[PDB]
Amino acid sequence: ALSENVLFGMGNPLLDISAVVDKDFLDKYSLKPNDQILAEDKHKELFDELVKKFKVEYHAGGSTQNSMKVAQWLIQEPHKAATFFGCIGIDKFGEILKRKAADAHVDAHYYEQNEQPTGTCAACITGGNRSLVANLAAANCYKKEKHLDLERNWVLVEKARVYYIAGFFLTVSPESVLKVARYAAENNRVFTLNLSAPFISQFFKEALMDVMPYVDILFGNETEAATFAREQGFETKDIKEIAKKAQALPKVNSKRQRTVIFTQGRDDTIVAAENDVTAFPVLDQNQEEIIDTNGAGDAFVGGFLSQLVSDKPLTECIRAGHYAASVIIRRTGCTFPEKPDFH
Ligand SMILES: Nc1ncnc2c1ncn2[C@@H]1O[C@H](CO)[C@@H](O)[C@H]1O
Ligand SMILES: [Cl-]
Numbered sequence: 001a002l003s004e005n006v007l008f009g010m011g012n013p014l015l016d017i018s019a020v021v022d023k024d025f026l027d028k029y030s031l032k033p034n035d036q037i038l039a040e041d042k043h044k045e046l047f048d049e050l051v052k053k054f055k056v057e058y059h060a061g062g063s064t065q066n067s068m069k070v071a072q073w074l075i076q077e078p079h080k081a082a083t084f085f086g087c088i089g090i091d092k093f094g095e096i097l098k099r100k101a102a103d104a105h106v107d108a109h110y111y112e113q114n115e116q117p118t119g120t121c122a123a124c125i126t127g128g129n130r131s132l133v134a135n136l137a138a139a140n141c142y143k144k145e146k147h148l149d150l151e152r153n154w155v156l157v158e159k160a161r162v163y164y165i166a167g168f169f170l171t172v173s174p175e176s177v178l179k180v181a182r183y184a185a186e187n188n189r190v191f192t193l194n195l196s197a198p199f200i201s202q203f204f205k206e207a208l209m210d211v212m213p214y215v216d217i218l219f220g221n222e223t224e225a226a227t228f229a230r231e232q233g234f235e236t237k238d239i240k241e242i243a244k245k246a247q248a249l250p251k252v253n254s255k256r257q258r259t260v261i262f263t264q265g266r267d268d269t270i271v272a273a274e275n276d277v278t279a280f281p282v283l284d285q286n287q288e289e290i291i292d293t294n295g296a297g298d299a300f301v302g303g304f305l306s307q308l309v310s311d312k313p314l315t316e317c318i319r320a321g322h323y324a325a326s327v328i329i330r331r332t333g334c335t336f337p338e339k340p341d342f343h
Helices: 023-028 045-055 063-075 092-103 136-141 151-161 167-171 174-187 196-201 205-214 223-231 238-246 296-307 316-330
Strands: 007-010 014-020 037-038 057-061 082-091 107-113 122-126 129-135 162-167 190-194 217-221 259-264 267-272 275-279
Touching: 007 063, 007 129, 007 296, 014 045, 014 092, 023 045, 023 217, 037 275, 045 122, 057 063, 063 082, 063 162, 063 296, 063 316, 082 092, 082 151, 082 238, 092 223, 107 151, 107 167, 122 296, 151 174, 162 167, 162 174, 162 296, 167 174, 167 196, 174 217, 174 275, 174 316, 190 205, 196 205, 196 223, 196 238, 205 316, 217 223, 217 296, 223 259, 223 275, 238 259, 238 267, 238 275, 259 296, 267 316, 275 316, 296 316
Parallel strands: 007 082, 007 162, 014 122, 037 129, 082 107, 162 190, 190 217, 217 259
Antiparallel strands: 014 057, 122 129, 259 267, 267 275
């Protein structure tokens, strides 16, 4: 039986707010029916209006937290197998988010501050369409020295066997990422990281390459891989070759070989390990049943991690990732039914 806090994540928590809205609402906030955006000045009151005017459903969100809740869902027992750290506000949304994280059986410990509201992501649904508006807000305000470094929180890091941090968090607290990564190397534990988005490899390459030697498992997708390769001078556009070259990057913990895992949408998931590159087909090809790809990557990682914590074989970790993604992409955002049916 797994211990509590066996899986640790940290990143940018967001309160997901989903609702069926109307034309007037979309028009007021200048939203096309399938826009996916970061909030601009015109959207700062959107979340308050959304909750006042419409019946909403709330979820614990943000990329890393999504992966934690999916992992927890598939782990099932114990509750609080997955830990999550990040920054929230001292507001009603922050209280709702704490409740949702608890409902998801994740052991969330948030840094709370008063300067910024809790981050939010609105899914504004009309018919089969949905408009996404994300406001990072408090998520950008995480303070290593006021949260991670406190013993009551650091000990939860020390409880983990496996760590996962989205590369998005390199834009907020790269020193937190480095400290966790260093601990993983010092203790021969598995540290995992997502490339997260092309802009991470372009604009945050210093932090990314500072952490890379500590990465036991690098997750990403084909678009991130292409950008990473260009920025690192790999001189190839072939995804398998990119994965092989990333696998062979400098590494401090030589007790564990790096694994590089790049998803390709409906095309094969590519896995580079020490002595080979293997392609894992995506067996779910019913494209017409896909209603929303938002969170597919987060769910893939969560499914993978759910099996990794039990030292299951690579094939099983990939199978669980593909399963989780297949569930999430048939629902608005990174959500799932009460119980998993992964066998
Ligand atoms: N178009 C698609 N068809 C089927 N599965 C998909 C698609 N896009 C994403 N996925 C699933 O989500 C994962 C992450 O993108 C993929 O590896 C796959 O498992
Ligand atoms: Cl994140």
